[PDB]
């Protein structure tokens, strides 16, 4: 499969982007610069981008920034920045309640929730303790906020009052997700357990203890996502594994790892695109598409810089990714589906784009892990391939080895 990077940083990770721009002006004579195509003007934050989300209407996009901490809202029809709104602190997470960009709830890092409306900052409130995630139920009109404390704070927008906060057994909630078809809710504790709660009642339906026979080291549930169908549930473990669970059973159907050993940040189910059995898992380093049922890697999106978040426009092949670099990378995968309506002729120019390209398929071991795993013998053989500090390995072989050691 082919991945086309429509915009972003084409330079390597080592090269600093800002000096490259100062060298870019010097090479402005080079013809390729004049012929460059930018889908959305000013699609770049000042230093880095924290989060990006696409409005359910399908005609707008929103993003949050680093310095000065600011909110960018983009209009697809105009292919440009509708407006930028500064903030008093950086944004940990946010959601778009309305179908359009009009109403959105923002969770800052200063322990404060800020409600943004068309005109501006409608209202700001402070939660008891620092927050890490946010979600909203349409049926209940109740905003559910995780936090460092064991409680999972509950705010009702309809009544404009805090309500009785759900009491998680464990301390801390890294991520929270809610299923549309069911209403079932999940919370990601620091310990390797996901506590499921019911919104109809105020109760803990059950808790699932993540089991890792491969790696015995501690890890945390960094991300959780529910499929549209509702019977499937995905987790993100800090060690670098993402589990797909069918909620009825108590065992992991498939455990696929990215291999770099970094935390999983975002998990997206590409049901809308077609061939619903595809899932996305995003590290800081790389984001991989692999089959749901068989765990075979479809394609890979590896930016030079770290990924803070990845978002997928419904019904289309494009992916927006929030990165640490000044630009915000966006990738087009023609095979998955057609390009969005707003950028119709992007398909016509597929030849001009970069067409960037093994890393997703295979697992990566650190040198210390190689010695602990007794794989020093594999070193220097076809089975083990060196990638810079550490060496790649086949996924199945690594699972067998960690069982041995």
């Amino acid at each position: 499969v082919s991945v086309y990077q429509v915009s972003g940083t084409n330079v390597s990770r080592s090269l600093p982007d800002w000096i490259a721009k100062k060298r870019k002006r010097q090479l402005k004579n080079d013809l390729e610069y004049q012929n460059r195509v930018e889908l959305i003007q000013d699609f770049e934050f000042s230093e880095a981008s924290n989060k990006i989300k696409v409005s359910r209407d399908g005609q707008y996009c929103m993003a949050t920034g680093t310095y000065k901490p600011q909110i960018h809202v983009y209009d697809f029809a105009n292919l440009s920045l509708k407006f930028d709104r500064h903030t008093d602190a950086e944004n940990v997470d946010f959601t778009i309640l309305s179908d359009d960009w009009t109403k959105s709830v923002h969770l800052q890092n200063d322990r404060s929730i800020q409600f943004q409306n068309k005109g501006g900052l409608h209202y700001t409130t402070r939660i008891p303790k620092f927050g890490r995630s946010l979600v909203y139920n349409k049926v209940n009109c109740d905003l559910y906020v995780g936090a460092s404390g064991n409680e999972l704070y509950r705010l009702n927008l309809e009544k404009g009052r805090f309500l009785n906060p759900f009491k998680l057994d464990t301390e801390g909630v890294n991520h929270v997700s809610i299923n549309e078809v069911n209403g079932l809710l999940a919370a990601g504790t620091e310990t390797n357990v996901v506590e499921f709660w019911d919104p109809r009642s105020r109760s803990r339906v059950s808790k699932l203890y993540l089991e890792n026979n491969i790696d015995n080291r501690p890890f945390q549930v960094t991300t959780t996502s529910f499929r549209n169908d509702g019977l499937t549930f995905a987790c993100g473990t800090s060690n670098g594994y993402s589990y797909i669970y069918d909620l009825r059973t108590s065992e992991p159907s498939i455990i696929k790892d990215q291999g770099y050993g970094f935390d999983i940040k975002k998990i997206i189910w590409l049901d809308n695109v077609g061939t619903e059995n595809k899932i996305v898992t995003c590290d800081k380093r790389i984001a991989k598409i692999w089959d749901r049922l068989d765990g075979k890697a479809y394609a890979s999106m590896e930016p030079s810089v770290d990924i803070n978040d990845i978002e997928h426009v419904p019904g289309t092949g494009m992916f927006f990714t929030a990165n640490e670099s000044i630009p915000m990378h966006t990738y087009y995968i023609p095979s998955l589906g057609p390009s969005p309506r707003w950028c119709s002729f992007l398909d016509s120019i597929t030849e001009e784009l970069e067409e960037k390209p093994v890393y997703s398929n295979y697992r990566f071991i650190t040198r210390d892990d190689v010695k602990k795993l007794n794989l020093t013998h594999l070193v220097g053989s076809r089975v083990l391939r060196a990638y810079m500090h550490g060496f790649f390995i086949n996924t199945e072989l690594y699972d067998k080895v960690s069982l041995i050691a």
Binding site: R126, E158, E180
Partner: peptide, 30 residues
């Protein structure tokens, strides 16, 4: 303790009152 919002206050907040309206249809499943 109550200052700086460290304790949770359940009094009604007028600006966010009636911010959003519930969907009466409910979840797709019965």
């Amino acid at each position: 303790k109550a200052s700086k919002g460290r304790k949770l206050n359940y009094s009604v907040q007028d600006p966010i009152a009636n911010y959003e309206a519930p969907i009466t249809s409910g979840y797709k499943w019965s």
